[PDB]
């Protein structure tokens, strides 16, 4: 197994409130090294948030989140974990695992993150409604057909897309998000393909929005 | 107490084949206890380089890092299409271990003008039957990046019922893609006949109209 951290976890709470986040790792001995969450705000560059020894006999933290938040580890299930509380506006942050490569407070191997989104305005986890994008003679020119999927009035960020479980990649553009004056996020991605292959592939689109756990897979016709 | 790291400046345009160099200030002498990390929107953050200067397994040898002190430096020699990215430097010498804001390198496109090819979806069926109307306006692979598309529906311009979206830069041809979405209540909606997505751009000596007549 190759080396893999996977974060999960992130989503909407109100200020005060608690969330949990996991990391689950794999394609390494896990319980070798030290592990570290690290973040990313709004408007800041990454903070260093907290540490813990290999052994777990230690734990550190940011002044900012000491008394607040609880790092601790499963060696046998090769699991990090960060107890939040008392979560406040400036908590905000995609959260990543990281892997300290040599003890020396600096990492090697990051998962992609989970977002963390602390709210008190009025809009409440909702996922989204996934609308296909059919191709058809209006989206097609020079032997290519462009479609896709509309994802539809989401809450809070983020949500992902991939083509047919990730085989699918050149000529894919999934846009950033909107804001909608509902206060719900909308996204569409497309992809243009062949012409000719609309009678004969399948074009499935992967929606997760695991802020709500929403999993979709819209298969787009023409 | 705690080190604070900065880095100058914050975004560059560069162009594919340059060299590149972007600097990292730490607030004290650190000695030669500074990694880079490059960040890409979505993507796990990467080490680079650890020790000021070594390179990290994989590490394509274009990168190379140098410094000592306060002041330390990340050079890419022929900055190639994958190297687009935000680099942010991280001390590991004391304290909390504090890392800079990030240098977004950008792309300093040369690149031909190109029009955008203009696409239009009706609202889906399933979307309808549930009460609301969104129509997709898609610009595919366009240079430059300035695009006016406007929504008219019966020939009527619209004001106030769309949204736009446009993604990052392609790093191998400098091109954008545009999504704009008119929403209206299915209501409004079948009120009308003719939808209309009308595009302007450097590309074009004047402006394109992609239509639908609503249920044809
Ligand atoms: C911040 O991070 C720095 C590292 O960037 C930490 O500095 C290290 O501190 C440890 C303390 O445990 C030092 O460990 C000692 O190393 C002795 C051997 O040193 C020699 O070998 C090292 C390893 O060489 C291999 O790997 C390097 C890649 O790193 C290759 O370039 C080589 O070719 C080899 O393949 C060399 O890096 C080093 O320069 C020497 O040549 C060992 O015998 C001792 O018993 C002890 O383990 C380590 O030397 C320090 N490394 C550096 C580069 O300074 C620092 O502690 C960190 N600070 C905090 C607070 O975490
Ligand atoms: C996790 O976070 C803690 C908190 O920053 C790290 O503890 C720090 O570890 C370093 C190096 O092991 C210590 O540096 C040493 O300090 C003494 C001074 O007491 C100095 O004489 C030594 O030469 C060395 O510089 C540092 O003191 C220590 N900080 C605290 C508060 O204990 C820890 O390294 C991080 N990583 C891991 C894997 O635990």
């Known amino acids: 197994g190759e080396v893999q951290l996977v974060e999960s976890g992130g989503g909407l709470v109100q200020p005060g409130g608690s969330l949990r986040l996991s990391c689950a790792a794999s394609?390494?001995?896990?319980?070798?090294?030290?592990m570290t969450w690290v973040r990313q705000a709004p408007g800041k560059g990454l903070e260093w948030v907290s540490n813990?020894?290999?052994?777990?006999?230690?734990?550190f933290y940011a002044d900012s989140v000491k008394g607040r938040f609880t790092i601790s580890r499963d060696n046998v299930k090769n699991s990090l974990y960060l107890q939040m509380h008392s979560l406040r506006d400036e908590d905000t942050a995609v959260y990543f695992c990281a892997r300290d490569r040599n003890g020396y407070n600096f990492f090697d191997y990051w998962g992609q993150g989970t977002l963390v989104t602390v709210s008190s305005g009025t809009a409440s986890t909702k996922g989204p409604s996934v609308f296909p994008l059919a191709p058809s003679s209006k989206s097609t020119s020079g032997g290519t057909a462009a479609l896709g999927c509309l994802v539809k009035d989401y809450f809070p960020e983020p949500v992902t897309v991939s083509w047919n479980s990730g085989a699918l990649t050149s000529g894919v553009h999934t846009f950033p998000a909107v804001l909608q004056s509902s206060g719900l996020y909308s996204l569409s991605s497309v992809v243009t393909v062949p012409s000719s292959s609309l009678g004969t592939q399948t074009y499935i689109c992967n929606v997760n929005h695991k802020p709500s756990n929403t999993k979709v897979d819209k298969k787009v016709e023409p | 107490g705690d080190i604070e790291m900065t880095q100058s400046p914050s975004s560059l345009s560069a162009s594919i084949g340059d060299r590149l160099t972007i600097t990292c200030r730490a607030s004290?002498?650190?000695?030669?206890?500074v990694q880079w990390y490059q960040q890409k929107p979505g993507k796990a953050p990467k080490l680079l380089m650890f020790?000021?200067?070594i390179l990290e397994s994989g590490v394509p040898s274009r990168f190379s890092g140098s410094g000592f002190g306060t002041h330390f430096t990340l050079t890419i020699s022929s900055l190639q299409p994958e190297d687009f990215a935000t680099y942010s430097c991280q001390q590991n010498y004391s304290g909390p271990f504090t890392f800079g804001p990030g240098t977004k390198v950008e792309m300093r496109a040369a690149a031909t003008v190109a029009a955008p090819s203009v696409f239009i979806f009706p609202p889906s069926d399933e979307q309808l039957k549930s009460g609301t109307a969104s129509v997709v306006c898609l610009l595919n692979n366009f240079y430059p990046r300035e695009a006016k598309v406007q929504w008219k529906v019966d020939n009527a311009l619209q004001s106030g019922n769309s949204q736009e979206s446009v993604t990052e830069q392609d790093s191998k041809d400098s091109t954008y893609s545009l999504s704009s979405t008119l929403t209206l209540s299915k209501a409004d909606y079948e009120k009308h006949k003719v939808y209309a997505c009308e595009v302007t751009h450097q590309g074009l000596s004047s402006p394109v109209t992609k239509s639908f007549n609503r249920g044809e």
């Open positions: 813990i020894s290999s052994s777990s006999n230690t734990a």
């Open positions: 020790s000021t200067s």
């Open positions: 394609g390494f001995t896990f319980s070798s090294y030290s």
């Open positions: 004290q002498a650190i000695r030669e206890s």
